[PDB]
A paper describes a structure:
The oral bacterium Porphyromonas gingivalis, a “keystone” pathogen of periodontitis, produces a dual domain sialidase (PG0352). Biochemical analyses reveal that PG0352 can desialylate human serum and complement factors and thus protect bacteria from serum killing. Structural analyses show that PG0352 contains a N-terminal carbohydrate-binding module (CBM) and a C-terminal sialidase domain that exhibits a canonical six-bladed β-propeller sialidase fold with each blade composed of 3–4 antiparallel β-strands. Structural and functional analyses further demonstrate that the CBM binds to carbohydrates and serum glycoproteins.
To elucidate the catalytic mechanism of PG0352, we first determined its unliganded crystal structure using synchrotron radiation to 1.84Å in a monoclinic space group. Initial phases were obtained utilizing molecular replacement in conjunction with a model of the protein generated using AlphaFold2. The overall structure of PG0352 consists of two major domains encompassing 493 residues (31–523). We observed additional electron density within the active site pocket near the side chain of Tyr-488 that we subsequently modeled as a partially occupied citrate molecule derived from the crystallization cocktail (S4). One of the carboxyethyl groups of citrate interacts with Arg-194, Arg-398, and Arg-460, a triad of conserved arginine residues implicated in stabilizing the carboxylate group of sialic acid. Another carboxyethyl group interacts with the side chain of Arg-213, mimicking the interaction observed between this side chain and the O4 of sialic acid. This interaction perturbs the side chain of Asp-219, which exhibits alternate rotamer conformations in the unliganded structure. The third carboxyethyl group does not interact with the enzyme, given its orientation away from the active site pocket. Interestingly, the tartrate molecule observed in the sialidase active site of their structure binds in a virtually identical conformation to that observed for citrate bound in the unliganded PG0352 structure reported here, suggesting that these molecules may serve as useful stabilizing ligands to facilitate the crystallization of sialidase enzymes. The positions of the side chains of Tyr-488 and Glu-382 suggest that they serve as the nucleophile and the general base catalyst, respectively, as they occupy topologically equivalent positions in other structurally characterized bacterial sialidase enzymes.
Author numbering: 23 to 523
Amino acid sequence: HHHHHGSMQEVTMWGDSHGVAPNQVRRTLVKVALSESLPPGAKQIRIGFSLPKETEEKVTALYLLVSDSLAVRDLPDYKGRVSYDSFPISKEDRTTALSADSVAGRRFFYLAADIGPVASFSRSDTLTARVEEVAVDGRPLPLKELSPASRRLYRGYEALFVPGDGGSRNYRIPAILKTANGTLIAMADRRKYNQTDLPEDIDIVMRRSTDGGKSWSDPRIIVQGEGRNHGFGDVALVQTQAGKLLMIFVGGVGLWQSTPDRPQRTYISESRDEGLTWSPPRDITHFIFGKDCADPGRSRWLASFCASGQGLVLPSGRITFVAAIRESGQEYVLNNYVLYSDDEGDTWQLSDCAYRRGDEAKLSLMPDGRVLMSIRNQGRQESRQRFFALSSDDGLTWERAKQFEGIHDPGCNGAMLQVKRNGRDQVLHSLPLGPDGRRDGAVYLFDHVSGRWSAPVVVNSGSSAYSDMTLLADGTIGYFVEEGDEISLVFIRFVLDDLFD
């Protein structure tokens, strides 16, 4: 019901549940939106709030931020693209007021905090606050609460690619690599004009860290899209046994538009200096499929792409990525084959078929030397579970491995890590929890000996999609995930006990 005796200002508020890390500045705890500007006759807005002792103990300062923009992420994540004023509050106070002139017509208010240096990082190590009152010239307004605040502390948490960064509207498709020397390489689709895939015009962008993810270089475009049907994306990364970094990606038309005579092409580029410089992209499509393929039985295949994220370099030195290949123009179906090189990338071959009606697939090395492959469930097949397969000949031949099944896949890319926990060999697997949607990015542990999956632990609640993972030299896990409906690519660091103990 809407009344007809004047204008009705409405107040909406959201508690924040993005992760945080020690020493971060101006982290949003609660956002408040007015439905309209303060009336011209207004003089002051007062905001009262609650903040428990445990959160107060973990912050060094509080602020009221005021912006003309209603932003999804912490305001410094937009690097000045969101303009805001910052009004300090003693961390002991529970109310604050601003003149209407200071507010200057703006509608969006952020209760924010500087995070202190300490944390235990346990599941219970979370920050919260609540806005309790919003009053204009002493008159309280009814508050519409849409979410509670709960920000979990992680050993590291940083949005590496945020919509607008560098002038790119959007970002998707995370890939992370740790080199033998400890360098971290983070790549992404720089989705410059919107969030859609090829044949849209897309670049590949990179950031590097030489201090374990504490700080990151300015983003660099390393492969520039040149127009619709001429973009590049879907990066996967390895480091070869010789030490060179190898990135594989696709470019051109979209997957379902690719044909044998006009393919969406697969390229590789290498770095011999920890990701500083990269070789001009080399087209390797002819090793895989299409009119230039020397295997006549693959010359009529239509499309191929390797799963974004990471490949796998075997102890022998064989370099592997799983391709998802379209063999027929009649159907929207893909089959998986391992794309591999035994000569440091000079030439490439295909395994026997690893999975029928597959999709983006990933490899990891079992403790006994076998290769485990994890296949995305496309089209809600069977019981909507993640699919698995095993190879005992270093990836040449495959058999379905139903014993690894037991986790739901809403239909999304994810990653695995082989880990040892309390003396047991286990596989960590990242996926959205769903169910049946891109929501709540989670990790699970599979115990090799019992054949049982753990309960999931949600790393990032809310909208969540592709994830990649790497082991850092000191045993911490780096988790690189698509957060939000308008995606930011976020790098989170934790140890397993932080999530499962």
